[model samples]
Target chain A: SMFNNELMADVHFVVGPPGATRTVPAHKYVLAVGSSVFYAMFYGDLAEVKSEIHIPDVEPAAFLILLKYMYSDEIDLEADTVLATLYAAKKYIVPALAKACVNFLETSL
Target chain B: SMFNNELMADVHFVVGPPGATRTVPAHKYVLAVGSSVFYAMFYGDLAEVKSEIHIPDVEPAAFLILLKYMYSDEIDLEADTVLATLYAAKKYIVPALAKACVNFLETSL
Candidate 1:
């Protein structure tokens, strides 16, 4: 499972804007195998062949949470990042994670 | 999942030999994510960058069964091919499938 194995990562995501951006390493296949958007982005007809992609306007923390959930099926979101994580989940079309984030929001509200 | 979605498959396996050979489509990422041997074959330092792999001596039926188990976690084997399925499973280091194959052999014996 590519959970913490950044050494084997093939895709690099430059998350957030300048001055605070974080480089997140990942394996594209794992992401594509799990997410349709990722599959389309990496393997579809209009897929980007770019190795390193710059992500605009997504929080690094939230993205990591999303990645963790995608890679391992384990999710954790704090009060400050739960909403952002939900947005990330929806943005990537990961229904289960999005549903979990919504459930977390509903209970904590 | 890449189970029945041949359109999205990125890897091709030319299994068997000569007159009886079969072309099996697959996704490298799914295989690598599931098996150490596949991970090394696809992503290791001395890995083969070839998109199409030729697997010698594996029965096409058993290999397909192995692929189905890898891609979808569903194990299906009949009396004629269970042993070959076990060999394919062991060759790829898919312990779960190998264990299932062993159990099937034990029960069917």
Candidate 2:
């Protein structure tokens, strides 16, 4: 996947619970442009300027899917992933992906 | 115009002919993300390090429309300004604006 092959990644997301954390590489600027949450997280006064970020709230799978959307504008909204992905997108302030999930759910239902 | 009231601009474009140049404020990162020509110009090895750039090739009206699209994704495609705007878009390597120009020209023709 393009998510797995990030060539311009400047930030890493340490996702999932402790002892089971998975690191996902991504471009900080791209993330910032994609979502206001990430914009604040990376550029605000209380920014986590460190290369690695701990996100225990987001599951590895959902975060990966979110990264897919952020990096490539591609997403998979399966029955199992859509809800979780929607949550992550909303939490991260990615309106496009959130609206995409809503549109998918709306049409699917 | 929103182009005249830029609050987050970090770079300035000195457009029009010499002695009648106008300064247009813009975000360097936004310009970089929006166009590869700008990206390379702003961040590449031969980057323009000055605060102001002289772009005598692009007219103020067309460049203003281009900035509106770059900053807010809003553009006006009319017969009078569309051709000049299209030329600016292509010269700057902004594909979306260029495509919009092509589409507008196609339909207008």
Candidate 3:
């Protein structure tokens, strides 16, 4: 669909501008780029719009997942997925990983 | 900052593509386009990544705000702000308005 293509192009334009995409890896993944929880945390949550997301200063991955929740508002975390999510969250700024980790801990309770 | 321009242009390119930006206005609004709460809902929640965001068959503005929260998880709503938000959301697809309305009803309790 033309709209779909336009949307994809728009995604690249925003997320992969001149040198900004440098921060994110070049890979094809499902879920819209900015439309994901990952993008949300990068904007408002990290910027501290309402209440700053307070996590007990952990690794980048942990922080990443938390940022993800700030963006997505929903995540289904599991014990087995936490470690890999932590790794990916640390390596990349993907927000979903952060949300998933937090959900895992919250549900683990 | 040179980096800032890159970011801004990136935003324009994505949100307001050749024809898509026509969807959003050419005004200066903050919270970042895709990087905002607005874009997330458009991509995930409304798209039904996990479960659909059910808010009834609402006006464009109502959905706009829901999309906004999906993009950004924070909202500071005022009582009088609803009408304006609904208007803006409907006219310009501003995602934050839908979220504010949702938050207002949720917090009205």
Full-model lDDT for every candidate: 0.80, 0.77, 0.37
Tens digits of lDDT, candidate 1, B15-47: 774357688888888889989878977887546
C-alpha displacement of B12 in model 1, angstroms? 44
Top model by lDDT, which number?
1
Q: What share of the reference contacts survives in each candidate?
A: 0.00, 0.00, 0.00
Error of 1 at A36 (Å): 0.5
Segments of candidate 1 deviating more than 4 angstroms: B1-109
DockQ score, prediction 3: 0.02
Q: Which DockQ-derived CAPRI band holds candidate 3?
A: incorrect
Q: Chain A TM-scores, one per candidate?
A: 0.92, 0.84, 0.29
Q: How much does candidate 1 score in TM-score?
A: 0.48
What is the per-residue lDDT of model 2 for residues A62-94, given as tens digits with 9 covering 90 to 100? 888898888788877787778878878877878
Error of 3 at A50 (Å): 33
Note the DockQ of each predicted structure.
Answer: 0.01, 0.01, 0.02
Across A1-109, the per-residue lDDT of candidate 1 in tens digits comes to: 5764677888888777445778899988889988987997788754636667666456899999999988888888888999988878876778899898899999995
Q: For all candidates listed, what's the TM-score of chain B alone?
A: 0.92, 0.84, 0.29
Better of 1 and 2 by TM-score: 1
TM-score leaderboard ranking: 1, 2, 3
Write the residue-wise lDDT of candidate 3 on B1-109 in tens digits. 2221334322321222222322222112332353333344234333212121222113334334433443455454555556545544543355455555666657764
